[PDB]
């Protein structure tokens, strides 16, 4: 397939879409022809490909079940700990309305209720107004008590198997090129894992409480219905606090509405300014209530030192998950040249996350 | 691991006295719960073995009054340890059956699922008996209960693939285990002396082959209604949906009507009774039906007698099939449960049962 390929014109694609439909969904979803449940790819980020599935007004719901859903499917391995952290996220959400109704949870995806919105831009998370109402969006979320592993070793135990099965599907031999600029020149899956158990000897130096976490805070995942919601907790775990806020800021520089190769651009400029993360912080903290209105700016100030040292860590992060899809995701994302450019973002901003130390 | 330490224990070990075992459920609620959890010393931490189906062993775990929760987390939790054998699927339509349980508040909280178990909030109550299942004024209570878990909307797998899914995992993991030559042997008064995994596999492929032509309605199914899931809090509740998932709904029902006949309250090994003759009588279904459709409110009252009628007729197939499901499953806890159950004969009890009832299920054809 590509950008433009019309969905249901795949057969086969439109067979499986029509299986999982009927088999979460049931009532008209079983029976209706194959040629009367209409399938249309919808835009979306580089973690998954979307397909709107939809019955003809000719076999319409003929009980409770909806007449459009959406099938969203990923390609990042699965682990026990995440198939049932997932699970009991996506059900909580669904179950306190604070989500997509969940319809169905398979190997590799998912099937939810169709949200009609549209995400915000790149540029759009940096406009004041926009971020002011991010950040009570994050401040909720981090409020949120999930039944589920409360210490931070997400990050970490998903790093260690990405590395571990990248490790395997590269020979020993094989080594990444980076952008000198960086520092290092280029690293094989040896150093990245030295690097992993840096990290690992560092994050847990940080004193940034520990919260549930969204950990993909992109612009494609906060969106305005047709108010902002966050969607997508795919990557979700209790985690840093200041993970969340140290991803979310970078996203700020990372453009994903680019139509040539390796379509995502980075400007490193756009980063907020200090001033601009700690409006962030202090709408944050105001709507957590759980700071006097006298201390507000200075717990700020303390966010935004805490936020820092997870900056490497977002991109050493999301370059060794970049570097994995490469083999694993049919995603139309230059995927190896963004796994080699988050690295290098890694190299070059190491020392905030050393000098927790 | 958790198992290892377990098939050490015994029913009359204090919990409290098995360090190891403390230091396991200490990491759990840790790691689960938080705060006081956290840093409670093991002294503090106080651990009771609670009687439990043989499905799984139960331990409460508390902080003492010494170090009292410092923020939202209970003060006690249960944690349930399992011997059955995950799959992705099942991982799956746990997490999403307990937490919508949860949150839906028709279950104990959930606090947390991990590889072999999970911790849940734990309630002050006692179980039914055996005898207890078969008294009209209980009997009509569950049945008005399983009329409400049928009309729960379940985002999990729709079609009944659960039951024959389960089973064969579970046959193919049971062949592995033991000597290909390997028969287990049957009492004879049932119609077959022995069989080994090949047969169950055959037999496997006729209880699948003639469960699809049931016109049973499909829906979301406890499918382990014995009286221990069944308890009078400190007003019945229905607890551990472990084996749930959409199914036909005659299994609950035949499944159910068969637990009538098996007490678990036994001293001596093989440690359970069972009594055929305490099945229910047709009237004594009936009645139960009679309730479960006046529940579910999509009846007219003048057709609630010809209705349950209905539901026994289509309820008889299954009896043989939650006699061949819990029969495969026996034999495959033999090698993997450390409780205190006979678990080979029960296995060979439920098999002989099931082809002493097979024709019910040939007969669908
Ligand atoms: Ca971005
Ligand atoms: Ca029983």
Same mark, same amino acid.
């Given at each position: 397939?590509?950008?433009?390929? *019309?969905?249901?014109?795949?057969?086969?694609?439109?067979?499986? @879409?029509?299986?999982?439909?009927?088999?979460?969904?049931?009532?008209?979803?079983?029976?209706?022809?194959?040629?009367?449940?209409?399938?249309?790819?919808?835009?979306?980020?580089?973690?998954?490909?979307?397909?709107?599935?939809?019955?003809?007004?000719?076999?319409?719901?003929?009980?409770?079940?909806?007449?459009?859903?959406?099938?969203?499917?990923? +390609?990042?391995?699965?682990?026990?700990?995440?198939?049932?952290?997932?699970?009991?996220?996506?059900?909580?959400?669904?179950?306190?309305?604070?989500?997509?109704?969940?319809?169905?949870?398979?190997?590799?995806?998912?099937?939810?209720?169709?949200?009609?919105?549209?995400?915000?831009?790149?540029?759009?998370?940096?406009?004041?107004?926009?971020?002011?109402?991010?950040?009570?969006?994050?401040?909720?979320?981090?409020?949120?008590?999930?039944?589920? !592993?409360?210490?931070?070793?997400?990050?970490?135990?998903?790093?260690?198997? !990405?590395?571990?099965?990248?490790?395997?599907?590269?020979?020993?031999?094989?080594?990444?090129?980076?952008?000198?600029?960086?520092?290092?020149?280029?690293?094989?899956?040896?150093?990245?894992?030295?690097?992993?158990?840096?990290?690992?000897?560092?994050?847990?130096?940080?004193?940034?409480?520990?919260?549930?976490?969204?950990?993909?805070?992109?612009?494609?995942?906060?969106?305005?219905?047709?108010?902002?919601?966050?969607?997508?907790?795919?990557?979700?775990?209790?985690?840093?606090?200041?993970?969340?806020?140290?991803?979310?800021?970078?996203?700020?520089?990372?453009?994903?509405?680019?139509?040539?190769?390796?379509?995502?651009?980075?400007?490193?400029?756009?980063?907020?300014?200090?001033?601009?993360?700690?409006?962030? +912080?202090?709408?944050?903290?105001?709507?957590?209530?759980?700071?006097?209105?006298?201390?507000?700016?200075?717990?700020?100030? *303390?966010?935004?030192?805490?936020?820092?040292?997870?900056?490497?860590?977002?991109?050493? +992060?999301?370059?060794? !998950?970049?570097?994995?899809?490469?083999?694993?995701?049919?995603?139309?994302?230059?995927?190896?040249?963004?796994?080699? *450019?988050?690295?290098?973002?890694?190299?070059?901003?190491?020392?905030?996350?050393?000098?927790? @130390?």
């Amino acid at each position: 397939m590509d950008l433009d390929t *019309d969905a249901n014109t795949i057969p086969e694609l439109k067979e499986r @879409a029509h299986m999982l439909c009927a088999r979460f969904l049931g009532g008209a979803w079983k029976t209706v022809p194959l040629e009367h449940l209409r399938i249309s790819r919808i835009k979306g980020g580089m973690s998954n490909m979307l397909f709107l599935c939809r019955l003809s007004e000719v076999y319409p719901p003929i009980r409770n079940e909806p007449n459009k859903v959406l099938l969203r499917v990923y +390609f990042n391995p699965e682990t026990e700990s995440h198939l049932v952290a997932e699970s009991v996220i996506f059900t909580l959400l669904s179950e306190r309305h604070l989500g997509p109704k969940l319809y169905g949870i398979f190997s590799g995806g998912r099937l939810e209720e169709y949200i009609p919105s549209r995400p915000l831009s790149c540029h759009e998370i940096s406009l004041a107004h926009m971020s002011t109402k991010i950040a009570k969006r994050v401040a909720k979320v981090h409020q949120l008590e999930v039944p589920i !592993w409360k210490e931070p070793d997400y990050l970490c135990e998903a790093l260690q198997r !990405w590395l571990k099965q990248l490790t395997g599907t590269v020979d020993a031999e094989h080594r990444f090129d980076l952008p000198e600029e960086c520092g290092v020149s280029s690293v094989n899956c040896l150093d990245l894992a030295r690097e992993l158990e840096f990290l690992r000897a560092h994050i847990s130096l940080s004193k940034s409480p520990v919260t549930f976490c969204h950990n993909d805070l992109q612009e494609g995942n906060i969106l305005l219905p047709k108010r902002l919601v966050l969607i997508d907790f795919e990557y979700a775990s209790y985690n840093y606090r200041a993970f969340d806020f140290a991803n979310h800021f970078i996203e700020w520089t990372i453009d994903y509405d680019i139509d040539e190769a390796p379509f995502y651009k980075i400007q490193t400029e756009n980063f907020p300014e200090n001033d601009q993360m700690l409006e962030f +912080f202090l709408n944050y903290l105001r709507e957590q209530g759980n700071t006097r209105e006298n201390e507000l700016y200075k717990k700020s100030e *303390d966010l935004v030192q805490e936020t820092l040292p997870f900056v490497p860590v977002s991109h050493f +992060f999301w370059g060794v !998950w970049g570097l994995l899809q490469v083999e694993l995701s049919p995603v139309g994302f230059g995927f190896a040249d963004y796994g080699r *450019d988050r690295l290098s973002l890694y190299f070059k901003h190491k020392q905030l996350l050393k000098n927790l @130390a």
